Amino acid sequence: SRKTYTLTDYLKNTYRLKLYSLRWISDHEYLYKQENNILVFNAEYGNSSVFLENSTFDEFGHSINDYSISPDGQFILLEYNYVKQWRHSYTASYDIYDLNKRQLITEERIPNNTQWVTWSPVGHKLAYVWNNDIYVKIEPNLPSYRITWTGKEDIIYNGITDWVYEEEVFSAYSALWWSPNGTFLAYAQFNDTEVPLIEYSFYSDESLQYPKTVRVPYPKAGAVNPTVKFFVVNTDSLSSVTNATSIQITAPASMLIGDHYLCDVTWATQERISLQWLRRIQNYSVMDICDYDESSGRWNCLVARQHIEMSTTGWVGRFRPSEPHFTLDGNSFYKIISNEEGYRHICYFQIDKKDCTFITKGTWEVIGIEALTSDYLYYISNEYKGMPGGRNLYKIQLSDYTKVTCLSCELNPERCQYYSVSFSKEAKYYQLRCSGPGLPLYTLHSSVNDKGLRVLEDNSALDKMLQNVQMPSKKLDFIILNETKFWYQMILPPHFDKSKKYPLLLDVYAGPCSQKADTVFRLNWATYLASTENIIVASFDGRGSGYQGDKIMHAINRRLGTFEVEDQIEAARQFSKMGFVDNKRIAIWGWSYGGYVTSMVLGSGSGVFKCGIAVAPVSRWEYYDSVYTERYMGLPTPEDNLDHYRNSTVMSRAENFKQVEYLLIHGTADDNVHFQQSAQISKALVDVGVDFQAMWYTDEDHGIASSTAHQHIYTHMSHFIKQCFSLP
Amino acid sequence: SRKTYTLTDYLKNTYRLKLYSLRWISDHEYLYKQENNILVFNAEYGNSSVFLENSTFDEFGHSINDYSISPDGQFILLEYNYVKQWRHSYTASYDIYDLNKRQLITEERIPNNTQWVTWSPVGHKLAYVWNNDIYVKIEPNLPSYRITWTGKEDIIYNGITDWVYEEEVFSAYSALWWSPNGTFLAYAQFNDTEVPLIEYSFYSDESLQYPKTVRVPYPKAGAVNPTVKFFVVNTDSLSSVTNATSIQITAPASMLIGDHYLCDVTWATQERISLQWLRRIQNYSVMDICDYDESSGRWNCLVARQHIEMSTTGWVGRFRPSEPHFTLDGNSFYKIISNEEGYRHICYFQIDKKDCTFITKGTWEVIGIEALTSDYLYYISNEYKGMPGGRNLYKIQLSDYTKVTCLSCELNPERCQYYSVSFSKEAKYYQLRCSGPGLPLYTLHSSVNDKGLRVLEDNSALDKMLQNVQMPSKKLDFIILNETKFWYQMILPPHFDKSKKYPLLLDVYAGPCSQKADTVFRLNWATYLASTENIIVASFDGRGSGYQGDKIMHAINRRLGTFEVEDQIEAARQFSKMGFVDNKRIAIWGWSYGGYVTSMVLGSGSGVFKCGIAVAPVSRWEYYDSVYTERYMGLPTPEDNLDHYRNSTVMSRAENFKQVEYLLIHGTADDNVHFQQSAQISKALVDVGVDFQAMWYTDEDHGIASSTAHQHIYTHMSHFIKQCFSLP
Ligand SMILES: CCCC[C@H]1CN2CCc3cc(OC)c(OC)cc3[C@@H]2C[C@@H]1N
Ligand SMILES: CCCC[C@H]1CN2CCc3cc(OC)c(OC)cc3[C@@H]2C[C@@H]1N
Ligand SMILES: *[C@@H]1O[C@H](CO)[C@@H](O)[C@H](O)[C@H]1NC(C)=O
Ligand SMILES: *[C@@H]1O[C@H](CO)[C@@H](O)[C@H](O)[C@H]1NC(C)=O
Ligand SMILES: *[C@@H]1O[C@H](CO)[C@@H](O)[C@H](O)[C@H]1NC(C)=O
Ligand SMILES: *[C@@H]1O[C@H](CO)[C@@H](O)[C@H](O)[C@H]1NC(C)=O
Ligand SMILES: *[C@@H]1O[C@H](CO)[C@@H](O)[C@H](O)[C@H]1NC(C)=O
Ligand SMILES: *[C@@H]1O[C@H](CO)[C@@H](O)[C@H](O)[C@H]1NC(C)=O
Ligand SMILES: *[C@@H]1O[C@H](CO)[C@@H](O)[C@H](O)[C@H]1NC(C)=O
Ligand SMILES: *[C@@H]1O[C@H](CO)[C@@H](O)[C@H](O)[C@H]1NC(C)=O
């Protein structure tokens, strides 16, 4: 009798997850916005005050898009006129509000169209990027000092990243790193002069008579990539008219030998910086430890003090060399590295000593190091109950590595099995965030004795609303494939009955180091497919998937479009043979890597799938960017991996699509996986005389996330699946 | 007759129409290519021999695309390495083969990537265009003389047209016109400096890592058009030492005022050239008559023999100002003009005298003037039986305009109601070519006592094959709307039965001066829809259509997207009265203008139609080109016609589409109706939440005509109509 979770429920966000986003600002207080007052909370006692009144900025004259408060609390950055670029990059105007006064500063304002801004970690110093050059402000109302002069659109980038670096190396537009003193400003410079450009049309509003051509430096696989330089500027010694001096730190000879990348920047102490560098062949990376010299005024990186990571089995790190977490003095640090068994665990490194010491071990993996104090290192792993898709927070005592406590496993075992955490400064308190399988639960804690302080948001409101609807349930379990455990999940319709046969949709991603079977609670298309259409939606993590060691993750090294595709077919075969799935109605779908796999599956000739939907698929590894592709496939030269680059396109399997109903969708302004990719898929289908369905989304990019497009594509695919499954 | 006309038959051409394409080379011989042998024929007696054996160039090494034989029969041009540009333009390599000898010419060869070649009209001089400049050859083996030096790719065009001029004005690449002597070479020169560029992606073979951006100068409505200059060179007075002397002919002062076009160039005599010009507001045109001054060396155009044409109710001419046919002495010419009742007839003009004399009159129109001799003007009209969609050859005795014979009406009246003609030089012989309603029949005749000589091709073969197929029939008829006749044609399934209800597809074009209802015999898609799928396929010629005078044709002046659209809806309504149509299954489709109308109909909210298909549609007139659009729509400024430009888009009707099932298809490399036009439609249906189907064809242009793409779209449209009509 209750209503079912409908397509329109998902689309209009009728059942919302409540959140509790805070920003720790000290060792015992955080900022939180409530009824859009920016408040401060005292962690120990829960009491709150009003940092910045909701009312303030009513007469400001513009919609304020985000804010940032100076660390040593005398000012606040008001971000407005936000215009978005790529995944992380955006441009914006900024005002500055002086708090010890009811006043916006009116002089020496940060310019409009600013590319990036950042407070120093302490005090109130400002660093920004405009027209691709760096600028520094010592005080909010004074003139800025110009640090670089070489900035040029699409060509020279100072302190911000170019397209590849934003997307694949740093996951940020930013390329600035202040010292903990705020004395030193470090920045990377990127040169893209000889990097080719991907070009495409943007139509814009009807009123535009002629289409625009968007042109972006984008190094496709095996092209000339950008180069990078790294610099450091003393921010305390600057002159109103005399040009600032930037000291350059050079990459180690073992990288300058060829094409390479800056991969990580991390200050250790006020006088030591850590640089991780990675060879274009992503086999070899070097951590450089560089110290400031009182005498010379320069930075020396002792060769004997370098740290090396190699991989014989695949590439380095999960998507990148892991982050190093330094002890307070800067003499040692902790880092995730693959152990001799191939499982990623925490290793202890001392700076002028060579090997490192494993402090965690076993048939699971550490996912991230989240905080370090002199008594404790806190990390998240999937150790609990051997479930690779779970997540908990653990604690190690550094005086005995065997002394390990799990801090989150038993807090709410049935409801919470997927945590993330956010510690105050010095880790005096931590916010725990549970993401499923029940409703998300946010809690606060004290670290001295790991006591539960409160409950910050339990989503009770959601709970009450959901009780009135036929929600689906989720199964997490595993199958065996050739002596190995591989997990899967199913989203089962309500009042599921195993004596009936249900149509099955295989939801697939399957990119390297991905995980599609886990314990998090989601409200999404699948929810609707199952609750209203009684469709089983299934996902499976096969060879190539992550968090279960290298044997499985690297099985696909130098070989995309291979074991990961086979394994999705085999999982389906095995789902077929469960008494409850009708083998006449099995479909497959996915987005991005997911579309490539889905396409490669549909073109395999397996006979197992009736129909599928590929959204924004890669169709040919030579079409995608250099950093991601080569990491998994090497270079597409005959000397290296050209044959497989050629044997693993969707075009080559064009003939087999005659055996299936295929819907191909792609947005036309996709700057990440270019429309070209699906354009070649269709040309290939056409050359061979195969019918299929298509949908381009004008001006949409890789996420197809504009509100109306979003509603449309999911509307379009629901029609498609419904009809594939003879469902009215 | 048992078997059916099948989709594959259409697509694979199981049933070929034979043709008889001949090339006259004198008053009494023609050449004909049978197999690959070139044959020469005698028209009077009908004997024939082999001019060029198919074997001659077996060791040429390159596949020969076409040939052109010098008018004095001494040499032949071989065209190879043919690369297609737009509709008429293309590049190619050329060799010249000396006939009296059997020698290829090795000296001073025509260059690669040549853009246009043409023999003089009498002898064997050559004029070609390479890198946008004109070169002349007196003798095939001698060095060429460079006539222009200003040529610049995409900017200066000497002797060839820019994109608009090629497609909308001359319907040709060529912009060279030899004088009948061969003495003078007259050529146009276009300057596209300020014309904006349409840009679009072209993806090419799979192997291209980066898509190429194609950029073409193309004035969209109301943008900066190209400019034109006209020159005439004396080709008898060229030297190697001195440069060629080009004499410019300026346009009339009444054209120089504002923006204008060069519409027609026609040589009257060895020393007289006729030029027509047209004002950007294409409602006024001026014919200029220019003579060579033997002493001066110049060309003078006496403002006094200027002839003016103005239209009160609309534009000038059908798709342009009609062409003049000059009597041999040059002093007078005949030309089709709209008369005072609004019908297009032949008018006689004497060069220095006012007005002109109409030699034909009546409620019908002359379609073309086909030949002129001392005693007779030959022309084609649609007078016979008052059928606007019929065509016939007529003869008028010049010494008494009331003496008008129909030369074609009674030859084969039940089989032939649509002819075209081709006359030999001096018109002593003519080939008739009938196109329907029966199978095409090609016949040769002598002009003396308009006698039949021979039957050239009667398609007997095709006849018998077709006897064994259940072919559809064709109903050609009319409906009365106000006090006016509007013609439709129906394509009826075999064994038609006026008692049963058939589903109907309205096949629409409906752009200005178009005619969809006629007596032509066609084997096409509609053929299949009727014969195999038992679908009636109807076309209708309403307001804005042509060959019925101006009341009908100009009714849509400055109002595109109105009466032509309404009228198609009304036609389908009328078809429903007629009791053999199922009004729950009426559909509509079109290409180009047809696409535009279909989409405008589908969005009218009319309820009449269930579904439709739009291929390569214009969606906004500001997107299409300047010459065509401004012809019917004026300028898109507030002071001229901007409101209707904005009330006539497909985008604005978007909400209405929820009422129907729509399929939109467009080639990504359409340089004519830019993909932009459908990209904007798709985004508008998306912004308003209307579902629909789509299909882009990568790298195809406005014709989407490569064999595979053609097979695929028609396959895909078949599936669409079939399911729209609940037909298996
Ligand atoms: C064919 C399309 C594939 C697309 C992207 C997939 N994402 C998601 C996971 C991830 C996670 C990263 O750090 C955690 C990360 O750090 C660079 C990159 C990525 C990749 C980057 C790649 N751009
Ligand atoms: C909205 C798209 C429609 C575009 C095309 C329509 N055709 C058909 C009729 C026609 C007939 C002509 O001579 C008879 C002609 O001579 C230049 C041009 C045309 C136009 C050219 C214009 N390219
Ligand atoms: C919390 O309460 C204590 C006692 O009044 C006070 O000192 C503190 O400032 C309060 N904190 C906030 C952020 O309101
Ligand atoms: C402003 O803050 C008050 C104080 O609680 C809150 O109740 C009110 O709803 C907020 N007003 C706005 C602008 O949302
Ligand atoms: C930036 O923007 C505002 C309006 O957009 C303008 O008035 C101002 O002068 C510009 N310069 C600033 C604030 O840096
Ligand atoms: C960028 O590198 C190019 C070499 O491709 C060089 O010409 C240029 O000087 C470099 N610019 C800077 C500022 O490093
Ligand atoms: C036709 O016959 C005449 C007389 O035999 C011959 O001279 C002439 O060359 C022939 N022409 C052709 C093209 O066969
Ligand atoms: C044209 O190209 C072909 C191959 O490049 C060559 O044989 C010839 O010499 C070229 N130049 C000409 C024909 O003018
Ligand atoms: C073409 O037109 C441009 C723009 O008016 C002008 O400056 C240029 O000289 C012209 N070129 C020629 C060769 O006519
Ligand atoms: C020939 O004439 C053109 C312009 O008329 C000039 O640009 C070219 O250099 C000339 N060369 C000679 C041979 O006089």
Buried b (16+ CB within 10 A) or exposed e, A34-49: eeebbbbbebeeeeee
State how far the Cα of B73 lies from the Cα of B164, in Å rounded to an integer. 35
CB distance B440 to B433 below 8 Å: yes
Strand order in the sheet with A357-358: A324-326, A332-338, A344-350, A357-358
Strand, helix or coil at A29?
Answer: strand
Nearest protein Cα to ligand 4, atom 2: A54
Cα(A482) to ligand 9 centroid in Å equals 74
Cα(B68) to ligand 8 centroid in Å equals 20
Mutating which of A11, A198, A201 best tests the B interface, going by the most B Cβ atoms within 10 A? A201
Q: Which residue shows structure tokens 């030297």? A: B239
State how far the Cα of B645 lies from the Cα of B652, in Å rounded to an integer. 12
> By the CB < 8 Å criterion, does A684 face chain B?
yes
Any residues with CB less than 8 A from the CB of B575 and at least 6 apart, and which?
B488, B504, B506, B538, B581, B586
Shortest CA gap A284–chain B (Å): 27
A67 close to ligand 1 (CB < 6 Angstrom): no
Any residues with CB less than 8 A from the CB of B542 and at least 6 apart, and which?
B486, B510, B563, B564, B567, B568, B570, B571
Alpha helix (H) residue ranges in A377-533: 460-467, 525-533
CB distance A10 to A475 below 8 Å: no
Strands B661-667 and B693-697: parallel
Shortest CA gap A717–chain B (Å): 11
Instruction: Return residues 275-314 of A near B (CB < 8 Å).
Output: none
Q: How many CB atoms sit inside 10 A of residue A53's CB?
A: 11
State how far the Cα of B65 lies from the Cα of B84, in Å rounded to an integer. 12
Ligand found nearest the CA of A194: 6
CB distance A114 to A134 below 8 Å: no
CB pairs under 8 A between A and B: 120
Q: Enter the DSSP assignment of B425.
A: G
* Radius of gyration of chain A, Cα coordinates, nearest whole angstrom: 27
What are residue B536's DSSP bridge partners? B504
Nearest in space to B267 (alpha carbons), one of B247, B237, B291, B286: B291
Q: How many CB atoms sit inside 10 A of residue A110's CB?
A: 20
Q: Residue B192 carries which side chain, given as an amino acid letter?
A: D
What are residue A667's DSSP bridge partners? A697
State how far the Cα of A384 lies from the Cα of A397, in Å rounded to an integer. 19
Q: How many CB atoms sit inside 10 A of residue B2's CB?
A: 6
Look up A259 and say whether it is catalytic.
Answer: no
Q: Which two tokens stand for residue A669?
A: 């302004």
Nearest in space to B721 (alpha carbons), one of B641, B636, B662, B649: B662
Phi, psi of A279 (to 5 degrees): -70, 150
State how far the Cα of B350 lies from the Cα of B62, in Å rounded to an integer. 51
State how far the Cα of A227 lies from the Cα of A250, in Å rounded to an integer. 12
Any residues with CB less than 8 A from the CB of B413 and at least 6 apart, and which?
none
Strand, helix or coil at B485?
Answer: strand
> By the CB < 8 Å criterion, does A201 face chain B?
yes
Nearest in space to B420 (alpha carbons), one of B458, B467, B370: B370
Buried b (16+ CB within 10 A) or exposed e, A479-501: eebeeeebbbbbbbbbebeeeeb
Phi, psi of A368 (to 5 degrees): -170, 150
Q: How many CB atoms sit inside 10 A of residue B182's CB?
A: 20
Domains belonging to chain A, first-starting first, are 1-13+468-728 (3.40.50.1820), 17-459 (2.140.10.30)
Inter-chain contact B203–A711, Cβ cutoff 8 Å? no
Any residues with CB less than 8 A from the CB of B76 and at least 6 apart, and which?
B52, B67, B68, B69, B70, B96, B97, B99
Handedness of CA A686, A688, A694, A698 (dihedral sign): negative
Nearest in space to B682 (alpha carbons), one of A700, A618, A693: A700
Q: Residue A360 carries which side chain, given as an amino acid letter?
A: T
Nearest in space to A445 (alpha carbons), one of A403, A480, A407: A407
Phi, psi of B201 (to 5 degrees): -80, 145
Ligand found nearest the CA of B51: 7
Contacts within 8 Å (CB) and 24+ apart, B290-294? B290/B249, B292/B184
Phi, psi of A644 (to 5 degrees): -70, -35
Alpha helix (H) residue ranges in A80-219: 163-164
State how far the Cα of B162 lies from the Cα of B190, in Å rounded to an integer. 7
* Radius of gyration of chain B, Cα coordinates, nearest whole angstrom: 27
* B200, B210, B696: residue with CB nearest A196: B210
> By the CB < 8 Å criterion, does B652 face chain A?
no
State how far the Cα of A538 lies from the Cα of A506, in Å rounded to an integer. 5
State how far the Cα of B471 lies from the Cα of B488, in Å rounded to an integer. 20
Handedness of CA A616, A619, A624, A630 (dihedral sign): positive
> By the CB < 8 Å criterion, does B687 face chain A?
yes
Phi, psi of A581 (to 5 degrees): -115, 130
Nearest protein Cα to ligand 8, atom 3: B112
B26 close to ligand 7 (CB < 6 Angstrom): no
Look up A670 and say whether it is catalytic.
Answer: yes
Alpha helix (H) residue ranges in A67-195: 163-164
Q: How many CB atoms sit inside 10 A of residue A65's CB?
A: 14
Buried b (16+ CB within 10 A) or exposed e, B245-274: ebbebebbebbeeeebbbbbbbbbbebbbb
CA dihedral B421, B424, B425, B426 (to 10 degrees): -80
> By the CB < 8 Å criterion, does B210 face chain A?
yes
Q: Which two tokens stand for residue A95?
A: 């005002």
Q: How many CB atoms sit inside 10 A of residue B29's CB?
A: 19
Any residues with CB less than 8 A from the CB of A465 and at least 6 apart, and which?
A15
Mutate to test the pocket of ligand 2, among B87, B165, B166, B168 (most ligand atoms within 8 A of CB): B168
Q: Omega into B388 within 30° of 0, i.e. cis? A: no
Q: Tell me the chain A residues in contact with residue B705 when contact means C-beta distances shorter than 8 Å.
A: none
